[PDB]
Amino acid sequence: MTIKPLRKAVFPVAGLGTRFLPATKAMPKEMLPVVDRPLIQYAVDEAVEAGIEQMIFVTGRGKSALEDHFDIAYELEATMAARGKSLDVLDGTRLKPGNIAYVRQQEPMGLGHAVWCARDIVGDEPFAVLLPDDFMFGQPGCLKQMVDAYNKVGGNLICAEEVPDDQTHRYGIITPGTQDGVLTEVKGLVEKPAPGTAPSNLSVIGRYILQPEVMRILENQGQLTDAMQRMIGDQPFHGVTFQGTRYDCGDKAGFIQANLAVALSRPDLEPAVRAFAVKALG
Amino acid sequence: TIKPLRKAVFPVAGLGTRFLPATKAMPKEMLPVVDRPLIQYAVDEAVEAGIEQMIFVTGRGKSALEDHFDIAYELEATMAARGKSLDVLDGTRLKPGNIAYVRQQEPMGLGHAVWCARDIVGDEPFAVLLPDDFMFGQPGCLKQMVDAYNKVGGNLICAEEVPDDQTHRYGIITPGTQDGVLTEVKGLVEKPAPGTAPSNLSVIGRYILQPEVMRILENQGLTDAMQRMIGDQPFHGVTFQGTRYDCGDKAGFIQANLAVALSRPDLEPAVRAFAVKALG
Amino acid sequence: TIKPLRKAVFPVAGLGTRFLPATKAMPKEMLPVVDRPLIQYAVDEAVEAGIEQMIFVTGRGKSALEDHFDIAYELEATMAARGKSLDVLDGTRLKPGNIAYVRQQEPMGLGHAVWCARDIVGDEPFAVLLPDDFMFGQPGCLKQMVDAYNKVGGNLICAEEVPDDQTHRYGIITPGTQDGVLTEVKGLVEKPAPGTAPSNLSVIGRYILQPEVMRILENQGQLTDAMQRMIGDQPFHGVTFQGTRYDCGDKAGFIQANLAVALSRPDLEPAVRAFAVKALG
Amino acid sequence: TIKPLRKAVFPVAGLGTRFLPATKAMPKEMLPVVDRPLIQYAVDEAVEAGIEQMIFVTGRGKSALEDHFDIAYELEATMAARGKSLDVLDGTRLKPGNIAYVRQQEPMGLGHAVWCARDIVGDEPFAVLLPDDFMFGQPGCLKQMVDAYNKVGGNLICAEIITPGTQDGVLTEVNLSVIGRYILQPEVMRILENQGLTDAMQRMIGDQPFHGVTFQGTRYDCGDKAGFIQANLAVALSRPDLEPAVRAFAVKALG
Ligand SMILES: O=P(O)(O)O[C@H]1O[C@H](CO)[C@@H](O)[C@H](O)[C@H]1O
Ligand SMILES: O=P(O)(O)O[C@H]1O[C@H](CO)[C@@H](O)[C@H](O)[C@H]1O
Ligand SMILES: O=P(O)(O)O[C@H]1O[C@H](CO)[C@@H](O)[C@H](O)[C@H]1O
Ligand SMILES: O=P(O)(O)O[C@H]1O[C@H](CO)[C@@H](O)[C@H](O)[C@H]1O
C-alpha cells in the first residue's frame, strides 16, 4: 500500500498537426525542429532531467520517424566514424533498451483517450504527461521544476500560466485557491469555457504529473480534464508556474519565435542571427 | 497462490538471415503460412490463452509488424467501396494499448530480448512466444499450457522429444516425474555436446515464466536464468497436443504451408490434386 | 529494323486484397516462394532477358519493394561480422539508376499503371511483367520471348491454354497461324462473358510492346483495348512458355509454386518430399 | 535552336550530418522553412520555370520525400471530415509519373548523384537543384535562369569560386560563388558516364556557351544552422499573418 515513484512519462504523439501543412503532411509534427532538435527530443530530455526512466509514446499511423529517432542510426553512426566525426552530437537521442515503449492510438480521439492508451504500461504508479508542442524554455526544465514541487506536496500537479482574456476559451481553466510561492491550489477546472464564463485566467499547460487514480477514472468513463476534476476533493492538486518562457509551437508564429529564441542563446549562432534579425527588421 | 497470466512477450528483432533473400527487407516474422504471417498466428494463440497485453521487442527494419496490427486506413476504405467484408481482418487489431513495442537496439539474443520488456511486465508472470515455432493444433499451444498453469502454477515450457543427432541444437531437459502431459524439469543444459545429452526432450519456443526470472535477468545484465529457478518453484515441461513446424528452417516453412493448406476446405482439393501429380 | 529491348515495367501497386490478412501491411509482391519474393523472380527474369532498366510503378505502403533492391546496410555489416557470405544476396542489387520508381497515386488498373512509365520509356519498346504470374522454367519466360522478338519484332505476349470456365478471367486471343512456339493474334477481348470466348488461349502477365502502344494509352486519357488497335500493322504474336506457370494470384497457386520450387531444391527436396507423402494419406 | 528544358535533377541522398540530431532519422531535405520543406520550395521553383519531369536521386532513410509528393490518403480524408480546404496542399503533388525516384545506393558525391539520372534524362538538357540553397525571390532562381537560357542556350549556373570575362547584365561568361542551380547540356551526362566530377563541366567551356547567372533575390545557405534560422525569419516576416507577432518578438528579444 506504499506509493510508487514516478519513473514514467506519457507522450501524446499521434496528432495530424493539420495546422502546419504542408510541412506536416508526411512528417510528424513532433519532429519539427527548434534549431537542431525535434520537439519530442526536447520533451524527453526534459523528462530525463526530471528523473523519469520510462518514456511511453502513444503514436499514430505515419510516425516511424519518431521511432527511428530514438534507436541506433546504424548507417549514420558508421558514416560519421568513417569521418572521424564524434557521436557526441547524438548524446541523449538513445535511451537504454526498453526505456521507450510505443503503443498505437489507432483512432484519433483526443488527449484523454491517448493517455488512457498507456493504462497497462503505467499500472499503479504516478505518471507524467508532456505535450511536445508546448516548448518550455528554461533551466531547470519544466518537468524538473514540477517534480521538485511534487517531492514536497505530492498528489497531482499541472503547469499553470496566466493567459489573456480573449485566449481563455482555448485552454482548460483553473479556479485558484491559496498561493504558496510557485504553487497555487486548484479548486476547480473547466475545459475551454465560453467567452464570458471564465472562472479566471490561469490555464492548464501541457505538463502534468498525475496519480494512478486518474487512469482508473479514465478507464471507467471508458476525457481528462473532467477526470482530474473528480480528484479535487481528496488529493493535493496544485498548479505550478514555470521559471522560464513557454512557446506555443502549436501555431506557426510560436514555432518561429522559439527557433529565434534558442538560436540567440547559442554561442555559435547568435552573432550571425542577431546581425541578420537587426537588418531584416528595418 | 498462482498469479494469473495476461502478459506475453514476442521476440521479433531477428535478421532471419536463414531465409535470405526473402528476409532482406522484410521481417521474418511476417512470412505467411498460406495467408497470415507467423506473428499473427502467435498473437491469435495468445489471445485464445487469455492474454491481454502483447509486448513486441522489435528491431530496426520492422515497421510492417507495427502496421499490421493497426488500422489499415486506405485498405479498409477501398474494401468498403467494393462491399468487401472486413471480417477477413478480424483479430488483426486489438484494443488500443494492448500491443506495446520496445526496440531491442542491439541483437544480443533471447535473454536480452526478454529482458527488454522488464518494465512492462513488472512483478507478474509472463509468457514468451517465438513465432518461428509454428504450433498447429487445437486448442493452441499456449492455451493448453495456461490450462496446466492454472493448476500447477510456477514455470512451464513446451517440451518435445527430438532425435539423437538433433539434441545439440536445443536446450535439453533432465526429466523427473511425468503426470500425463506434464513432466518435471530437474535440470537443463543449453545445446549439449553430442554424446553428452541428459535425455531427448528439448525446449520449444513457448514459455510461461514467473517474475523472479526477469529479476534474475536484470541481475546478470538466459536459459541459464530459468534454471536458478528449479529448487524454488514448480517447473514443468508441457507436451503439445498437435504438431509443431520449425519455420526457422526452409523445409519446415514449406511443410507448414502445405499442412495448413490441406486443412483448408477451399484449398485442399486443388492442393492435394497438385501435390499428388507433382510427387510422381 | 527491330528496336532492341532494354526496358521493363513492373506494375506493383496492387492492394492484393485476395491474400488478406497477410497482405494487410506487406506488399503482395513481397510474398516469398520459398526464398525470394515474387518481384525478385520477376527482375531476375528480366535481367536474363537482357533488360537493363527496371521501372517500378508502386503504390503507397510499399517501401519494402524499394529497400529490397538497395544495400541493406546493417544486415550486410552484421553478416560480415560473422564471416557469412553475401553471395545469397547476389542479384538483389542492380547498378545505381537501373531501377526507377514512380507512384501510381490512384489504383486505376493495369493500363493506367503502364501509362505512368510513359516518360521513362519514351520512344522505345518495353516489357511488362506481372509478378503474380510465377513463371517456372528456363531459359525463362521473358528470355524465351525476347529470343522470338529478335527475329519477329513487333509485339508479343505470353499465351496459355486455360480451362473453359476460367476464360472469363483473362484477356482472350483469337489465334491465327501457329509457327512452333508462336501463334498470330488476330484479335483479343478482355475478360469475355462465359459463352462468348473466341478461344481458350489467354494473355499471361508477360508482354513486349512497341512505343506506339504508350502513345495510344496517353491518347485514351486501358491496356488490352490498346494492343488491339495494333493488329493490322505490327507483327503481333502469342508466345507459349516452355515451362509451367503458377498463378500466385490465388492461394492455391502460391502454395503449389512453393512446393514445386522446394522439390527442385537439392537441400529441401528430401525433407519436403518425405513430409509431402506422409501428410497426404 | 535550343532543346527547350523539361527535366530537373534533385540530389536528395545526403545524410545532413551538419544538422544532427534533427536529421538523425529525418531527411534534411524535409526541414521546414516555416511552412514547407526545402524540396517543396525547390520543386515549386522548377514548375515555375516550366520543368515537367522531376527526378529525385535519393538515399536509404528517405521515404518521407516520396510520401510527401503523393496523395496523403488519411489526411485528406480527415480534412474533408472537417470542412477544411485542401488548397493548403496545392503544388504538393504532380501528375503521376512526373516525379521519378532512383536510389544512389552509395554516397559518392554530386557528380555520381547526377550520373544516376543518366537514362531518365537521356539526350536532353537538364536542370539540377540543391534544395539546401534556399533561393528567396521572385520570380525565383530557376525561372530567371531559364529566361536567360532561351536566349543564349548552352550551360548556365547560378553565381554569387569563379573567374569571369564579359558581363552582360545578369550574365557573365565563365568570386562568383557557384550556387546549387544548374542548367546543363546532355553532353555533360556523357562526360560523367565516361569518367565513370562536376568540375568536368569545364571540359565544356571551349565548345558551348557557358554563363553564370546572378539571382535577383537573396540566397540562404540552409546547409548551416545560422542560414536555416535566417531563412525562416525572412520568410516569416514576408507573411502578412505572421510578421506582426514575429517582428514584435524579434525586436524585444534583441535588446
Ligand atoms: O492543447 P489541447 O490538446 O487542445 O488541450 C489540452 O492541452 C491544453 C494546454 O496546451 C490544456 O489547457 C487543455 O485543458 C487540455 O485539454
Ligand atoms: O532457436 P535458437 O535461438 O537456436 O534456440 C532458442 O530457441 C529454441 C527453440 O527454437 C530453444 O529450444 C532454445 O532453448 C532457445 O535458446
Ligand atoms: O491479371 P489482370 O491484371 O487481372 O489481367 C491482366 O493479366 C491477365 C493474366 O494474368 C490477362 O489475361 C489480362 O488480359 C490482363 O489484362
Ligand atoms: O555539397 P557540395 O556538393 O560539396 O557543394 C554543393 O552544395 C553547396 C551548398 O551546400 C553549393 O554551394 C555548391 O555550389 C554545390 O556544388
Side-chain angles (χ1 to χ4, degrees), chain B residues 117-140:
Chain B
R118 53 194 157 63
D119 304 321
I120 319 249
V121 163
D123 226 47
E124 276 222 30
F126 60 93
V128 183
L129 295 78
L130 310 186
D132 261 354
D133 276 334
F134 185 77
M135 309 302 272
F136 197 40
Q138 100 219 48

Side-chain angles (χ1 to χ4, degrees), chain C residues 6-61:
Chain C
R6 295 183 188 183
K7 307 183 194 249
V9 175
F10 301 71
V12 288
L15 308 205
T17 62
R18 304 179 185 171
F19 268 83
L20 273 20
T23 46
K24 181 183 169 171
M26 173 199 297
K28 77 174 179 192
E29 301 89 37
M30 285 303 295
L31 290 184
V33 8
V34 173
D35 277 340
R36 321 158 62 78
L38 292 169
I39 189 193
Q40 178 58 58
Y41 284 99
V43 297
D44 286 318
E45 191 161 305
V47 163
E48 168 185 55
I51 283 171
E52 42 196 3
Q53 171 79 78
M54 314 306 164
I55 58 193
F56 289 22
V57 14
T58 39
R60 272 177 283 284

Side-chain angles (χ1 to χ4, degrees), chain A residues 18 20-23 25 27 36 61 69 71 75 79-80 85 89 93 247 252 256-257 263 274 276 280-281, chain D residues 15 17 20-22 24-26 35 60 68 70 74 84 88 92 220 225 229-230 236 245 247 249 254:
Chain A
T18 69
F20 271 73
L21 273 7
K25 78 165 261 193
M27 269 303 314
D36 49 354
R61 220 146 298 119
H69 180 82
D71 199 5
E75 189 175 311
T79 299
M80 289 183 89
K85 282 181 189 167
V89 71
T93 60
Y247 297 83
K252 307 180 193 184
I256 280 157
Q257 283 165 30
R274 173 181 286 291
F276 176 83
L281 287 178
Chain D
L15 291 189
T17 67
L20 298 170
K24 181 181 169 179
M26 178 188 55
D35 262 335
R60 276 175 281 287
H68 181 79
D70 196 3
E74 190 176 349
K84 286 183 184 170
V88 177
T92 290
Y220 294 85
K225 303 170 193 177
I229 291 160
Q230 289 168 42
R247 177 184 293 276
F249 177 82
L254 280 188

Side-chain angles (χ1 to χ4, degrees), chain D residues 18 110 130 133 178-180 182 219:
Chain D
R18 289 192 280 157
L110 184 45
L130 302 184
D133 288 0
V178 180
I179 299 303
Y182 318 74
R219 166 253 187 169

Side-chain angles (χ1 to χ4, degrees), chain A residues 7-8 53-54 59-61 63-64 67-68 70-74 94-107 109 113 116-121 125, chain B residues 6-7 52-53 55 58-60 63 66-67 69-73 93-106 108 112 115-120 122:
Chain A
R7 32 156 203 161
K8 301 180 176 156
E53 57 185 44
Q54 172 76 67
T59 34
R61 220 146 298 119
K63 305 170 176 299
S64 330
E67 215 165 332
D68 297 326
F70 295 91
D71 199 5
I72 297 177
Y74 206 84
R94 206 190 70 198
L95 267 56
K96 244 169 172 172
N99 287 339
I100 295 196
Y102 308 79
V103 298
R104 299 289 260 258
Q105 185 191 41
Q106 290 180 18
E107 317 174 5
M109 291 196 262
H113 172 74
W116 171 76
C117 288
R119 53 194 156 77
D120 292 321
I121 314 218
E125 295 195 48
Chain B
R6 86 154 172 157
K7 269 173 185 163
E52 51 186 310
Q53 172 67 68
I55 264 287
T58 65
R60 274 187 275 304
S63 36
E66 233 157 288
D67 292 306
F69 294 92
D70 189 12
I71 295 173
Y73 200 85
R93 218 181 108 213
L94 274 58
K95 257 171 188 148
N98 283 334
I99 298 182
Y101 306 84
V102 306
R103 307 282 272 241
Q104 183 186 35
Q105 281 183 26
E106 283 178 303
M108 299 187 264
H112 172 68
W115 170 80
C116 289
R118 53 194 157 63
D119 304 321
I120 319 249

Side-chain angles (χ1 to χ4, degrees), chain B residues 2-280:
Chain B
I2 64 182
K3 297 181 161 175
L5 265 177
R6 86 154 172 157
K7 269 173 185 163
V9 174
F10 304 71
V12 298
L15 309 206
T17 68
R18 284 189 281 167
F19 272 71
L20 291 174
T23 50
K24 176 185 176 176
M26 280 221 75
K28 143 86 131 162
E29 301 74 44
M30 288 298 290
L31 292 190
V33 173
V34 182
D35 56 348
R36 17 187 76 224
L38 288 163
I39 17 137
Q40 183 62 65
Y41 283 99
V43 186
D44 289 325
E45 189 179 318
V47 177
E48 174 194 29
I51 279 182
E52 51 186 310
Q53 172 67 68
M54 308 305 150
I55 264 287
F56 287 13
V57 177
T58 65
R60 274 187 275 304
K62 314 199 180 309
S63 36
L65 273 96
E66 233 157 288
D67 292 306
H68 181 81
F69 294 92
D70 189 12
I71 295 173
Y73 200 85
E74 188 179 340
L75 168 61
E76 309 196 356
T78 324
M79 290 175 66
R82 301 175 186 179
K84 301 181 178 163
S85 172
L86 311 187
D87 305 334
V88 186
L89 305 180
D90 295 355
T92 281
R93 218 181 108 213
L94 274 58
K95 257 171 188 148
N98 283 334
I99 298 182
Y101 306 84
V102 306
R103 307 282 272 241
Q104 183 186 35
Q105 281 183 26
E106 283 178 303
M108 299 187 264
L110 187 54
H112 172 68
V114 171
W115 170 80
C116 289
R118 53 194 157 63
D119 304 321
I120 319 249
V121 163
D123 226 47
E124 276 222 30
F126 60 93
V128 183
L129 295 78
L130 310 186
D132 261 354
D133 276 334
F134 185 77
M135 309 302 272
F136 197 40
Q138 100 219 48
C141 191
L142 230 235
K143 178 74 214 306
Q144 305 187 186
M145 285 177 81
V146 79
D147 283 346
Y149 175 61
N150 296 308
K151 180 183 141 191
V152 189
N155 313 92
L156 304 84
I157 56 173
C158 181
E160 181 184 307
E161 284 269 300
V162 152
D164 278 22
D165 62 38
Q166 220 58 39
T167 286
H168 65 95
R169 311 170 67 234
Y170 302 81
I172 304 299
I173 299 174
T174 296
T177 304
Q178 303 185 61
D179 169 57
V181 131
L182 307 179
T183 141
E184 307 180 340
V185 30
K186 290 173 155 180
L188 59 206
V189 292
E190 182 57 0
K191 329 265 223 294
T196 233
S199 77
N200 281 69
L201 84 168
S202 60
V203 180
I204 300 305
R206 248 58 172 193
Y207 316 70
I208 294 186
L209 302 165
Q210 295 298 140
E212 353 294 306
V213 185
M214 274 273 75
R215 307 303 167 257
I216 214 102
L217 291 183
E218 304 166 315
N219 275 53
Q220 71 180 231
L222 329 134
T223 244
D224 234 316
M226 295 192 289
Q227 181 206 344
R228 276 208 230 152
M229 206 83 151
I230 20 192
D232 291 297
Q233 299 172 170
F235 207 149
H236 302 281
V238 182
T239 48
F240 180 48
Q241 307 303 299
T243 53
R244 161 227 174 208
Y245 296 95
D246 188 0
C247 295
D249 127 63
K250 246 164 265 194
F253 174 71
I254 288 153
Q255 291 172 19
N257 268 277
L258 187 55
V260 181
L262 295 178
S263 66
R264 230 63 118 45
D266 336 67
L267 303 171
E268 197 261 48
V271 171
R272 173 179 294 275
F274 176 83
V276 177
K277 286 195 178 72
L279 283 174

